Amino acid sequence: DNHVYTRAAVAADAKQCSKIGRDALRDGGSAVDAAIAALLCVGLMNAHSMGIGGGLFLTIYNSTTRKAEVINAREVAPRLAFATMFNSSEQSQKGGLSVAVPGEIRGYELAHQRHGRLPWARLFQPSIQLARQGFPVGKGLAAALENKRTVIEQQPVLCEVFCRDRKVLREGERLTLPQLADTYETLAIEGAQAFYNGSLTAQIVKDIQAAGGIVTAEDLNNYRAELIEHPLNISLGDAVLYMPSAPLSGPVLALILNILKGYNFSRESVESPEQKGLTYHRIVEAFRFAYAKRTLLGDPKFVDVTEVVRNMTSEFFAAQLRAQISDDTTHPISYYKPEFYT
Amino acid sequence: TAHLSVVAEDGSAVSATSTINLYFGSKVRSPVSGILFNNEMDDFSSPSITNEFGVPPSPANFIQPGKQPLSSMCPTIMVGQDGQVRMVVGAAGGTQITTATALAIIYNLWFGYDVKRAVEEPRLHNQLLPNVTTVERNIDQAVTAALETRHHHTQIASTFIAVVQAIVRTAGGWAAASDSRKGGEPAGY
Numbered sequence: 001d002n003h004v005y006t007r008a009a010v011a012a013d014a015k016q017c018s019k020i021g022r023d024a025l026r027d028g029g030s031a032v033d034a035a036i037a038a039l040l041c042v043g044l045m046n047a048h049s050m051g052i053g054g055g056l057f058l059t060i061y062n063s064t065t066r067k068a069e070v071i072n073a074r075e076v077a078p079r080l081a082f083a084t085m086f087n088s089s090e091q092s093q094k095g096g097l098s099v100a101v102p103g104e105i106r107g108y109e110l111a112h113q114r115h116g117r118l119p120w121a122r123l124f125q126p127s128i129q130l131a132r133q134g135f136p137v138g139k140g141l142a143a144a145l146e147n148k149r150t151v152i153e154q155q156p157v158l159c160e161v162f163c164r165d166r167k168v169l170r171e172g173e174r175l176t177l178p179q180l181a182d183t184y185e186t187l188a189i190e191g192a193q194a195f196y197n198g199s200l201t202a203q204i205v206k207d208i209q210a211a212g213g214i215v216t217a218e219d220l221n222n223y224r225a226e227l228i229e230h231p232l233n234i235s236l237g238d239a240v241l242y243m244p245s246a247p248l249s250g251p252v253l254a255l256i257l258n259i260l261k262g263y264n265f266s267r268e269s270v271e272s273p274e275q276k277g278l279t280y281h282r283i284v285e286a287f288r289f290a291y292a293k294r295t296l297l298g299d300p301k302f303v304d305v306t307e308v309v310r311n312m313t314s315e316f317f318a319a320q321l322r323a324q325i326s327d328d329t330t331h332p333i334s335y336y337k338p339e340f341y342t
Numbered sequence: 343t344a345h346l347s348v349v350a351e352d353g354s355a356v357s358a359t360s361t362i363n364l365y366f367g368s369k370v371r372s373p374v375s376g377i378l379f380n381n382e383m384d385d386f387s388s389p390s391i392t393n394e395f396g397v398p399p400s401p402a403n404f405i406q407p408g409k410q411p412l413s414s415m416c417p418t419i420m421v422g423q424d425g426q427v428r429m430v431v432g433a434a435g436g437t438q439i440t441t442a443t444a445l446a447i448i449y450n451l452w453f454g455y456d457v458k459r460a461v462e463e464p465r466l467h468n469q470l471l472p473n474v475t476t477v478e479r480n481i482d483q484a485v486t487a488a489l490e491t492r493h494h495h496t497q498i499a500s501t502f503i504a505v506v507q508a509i510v511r512t513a514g515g516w517a518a519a520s521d522s523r524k525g526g527e528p529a530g531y
């Protein structure tokens with residue numbers, strides 16, 4: 001109604017999934033239970049965006065211990081991948097070779113082992129129903145289907161679920177996901193191992209290879225979600241902000257905010273057109289300085305990023321960049337000193 | 343990419359961003375399992391592929407077996423000195439996730455916008471390369487003028503910039519917002 005709630009809240013990109021997370025909370029689930037239940041649902045209602053074929057990060061705060069952690073369940077390059085595997089955007093964007101090893105389900109499993117309070121099966125139940133029963137296509141999916149209408153209509157296996165009368169579904173029209181329903185059911189009952197080292201595994205490998213990919217059973221067997229006890233943080237006034245470091249973009253966010261905090265923004269910063277305009281100019285320039293550094297980032301297990309990240313989260317270093325923001329002009333690319341090698 | 347924010351009754355919280363990368367990922371659906379596979383390989387940099395006009399390959403983000411590609415995602419939790427959660431926030435929607443997340447935080451923490459306004463407020467984006475400031479359709483045009491007179495070349499996003507889900511502690515309890523750009527809505531008790 002108002003969306004101010006006395007006790008608990010779930011904010012997802014589909015109403016039904018916000019509700020499904022809310023119901024898990026109401027039935028005694030932790031924040032993690034609610035997030036998993038909602039995510040299983042978003043994987044259906046916003047299938048273009050995310051799902052069990054993908055990967056995720058969770059930033060988790062425990063109010064008891066007052067500790068934050070991060071769960072890294074992002075996809076990884078298969079063991080057979082190599083630097084020069086692609087020769088055009090087309091090759092890296094479409095078909096099996098574009099597929100990295102999915103981490104989603106191992107990510108749910110780890111977050112659930114550490115923080116769950118409802119049974120695993122209970123998390124999938126509402127989404128199994130939804131996928132079998134069907135749901136009206138929401139605003140977001142409809143626009144994504146419209147955007148990709150050509151590619152979807154010419155591929156029969158996608159059109160099988162995403163079309164009606166050989167044309168992409170529109171908003172309000174019913175979407176059913178009968179195979180995902182079965183798959184979700186298998187996951188609910190057999191657990192995470194069903195995906196990585198169990199009854200779904202050989203079919204996964206065969207689907208990726210049929211489409212030209214190189215993921216093998218061993219890639220699946222070997223996938224691991226990772227617990228990070230010490231996320232990135234930055235201090236802002238009397239508050240701390242927890243966010244994931246590389247390979248995610250916490251260090252960029254940290255740098256944007258640390259640059260901007262030295263201007264002491266407040267309601268006044270946007271009260272008149274003169275102030276507002278200068279304020280937004282400053283924001284954009286902080287974006288530009290923050291991105292200069294970004295191209296030195298990569299997976300910290302393969303790239304040494306400790307120095308880069310240390311700079312990006314340092315208030316002193318941010319103060320040095322803030323002093324180079326001219327209030328009366330933006331600058332050319334080289335002014336921000338983007339770097340491509342250390 | 344989709345973003346989800348949760349606060350439970352005990353004050354614990356989750357910020358969760360999940361993705362198959364581009365819309366419908368690889369466009370490979372299993373006819374048997376119905377799984378739709380990611381195209382996360384495309385988040386790697388590649389020496390052959392020309393990314394943008396003038397944009398070089400970044401060797402830190404080349405493909406290696408067992409390597410994870412760089413990502414714009416940034417699921418974030420803000421905790422006050424007293425140990426209570428102040429904000430749970432993150433974004434989805436491509437290259438503009440990190441700047442949209444920054445803007446949501448700036449809007450609420452500094453400009454004093456309530457969470458729904460912070461989510462709905464017009465956004466803008468610049469990432470250095472390419473060398474252009476994108477603004478949303480309904481941005482205050484005094485901002486557009488302030489950028490242009492300071493020599494930014496601005497352009498208007500033809501759709502929208504990112505998708506933000508957020509929760510913020512208030513006097514009234516936990517205030518939640520889902521981004522109308524995608525059509526979501528919060529739920530709680």
Ligand SMILES: *[C@@H]1O[C@H](CO)[C@@H](O)[C@H](O)[C@H]1NC(C)=O
Pocket residue numbers: 084085086087091097
């Ligand atoms: C592209 O070229 C490289 C180097 O010649 C080769 O190893 C690779 O298999 C090719 N890949 C594709 C997808 O065309």
Ligand SMILES: *[C@@H]1O[C@H](CO)[C@@H](O)[C@H](O)[C@H]1NC(C)=O
Pocket residue numbers: 030031062063064065114115116352354
């Ligand atoms: C907080 O810590 C306890 C004990 O270490 C743990 O069981 C629980 O997962 C945490 N609380 C939540 C809501 O996850």
Ligand SMILES: *[C@@H]1O[C@H](CO)[C@@H](O)[C@H](O)[C@H]1NC(C)=O
Pocket residue numbers: 196197198199201202217221
């Ligand atoms: C399951 O696990 C073991 C070792 O992890 C492996 O030998 C076996 O082949 C795996 N099974 C499947 C179906 O992937």
Ligand SMILES: *[C@@H]1O[C@H](CO)[C@@H](O)[C@H](O)[C@H]1NC(C)=O
Pocket residue numbers: 230231232233234240
């Ligand atoms: C912030 O960053 C590091 C963690 O490695 C450390 O200085 C400190 O424990 C962190 N601060 C908080 C409040 O967790």
Ligand SMILES: *[C@@H]1O[C@H](CO)[C@@H](O)[C@H](O)[C@H]1NC(C)=O
Pocket residue numbers: 307308311317320342
């Ligand atoms: C970190 O920043 C300092 C300037 O404060 C600079 O001299 C140094 O080279 C930087 N290190 C890296 C790895 O960028």
Ligand SMILES: *[C@@H]1O[C@H](CO)[C@@H](O)[C@H](O)[C@H]1NC(C)=O
Pocket residue numbers: 330331332333334473474493494495
């Ligand atoms: C980039 O854009 C800015 C203004 O939008 C301008 O100063 C500059 O000359 C442009 N080109 C390069 C290569 O930086």
Ligand SMILES: [Cl-]
Pocket residue numbers: 161176177178179180181375376
């Ligand atoms: Cl299906």
Ligand SMILES: [Cl-]
Pocket residue numbers: 013343344345346433434505506507524
């Ligand atoms: Cl989203």
Ligand code: NA
Pocket residue numbers: 002003458518519520528
């Ligand atoms: Na709201």
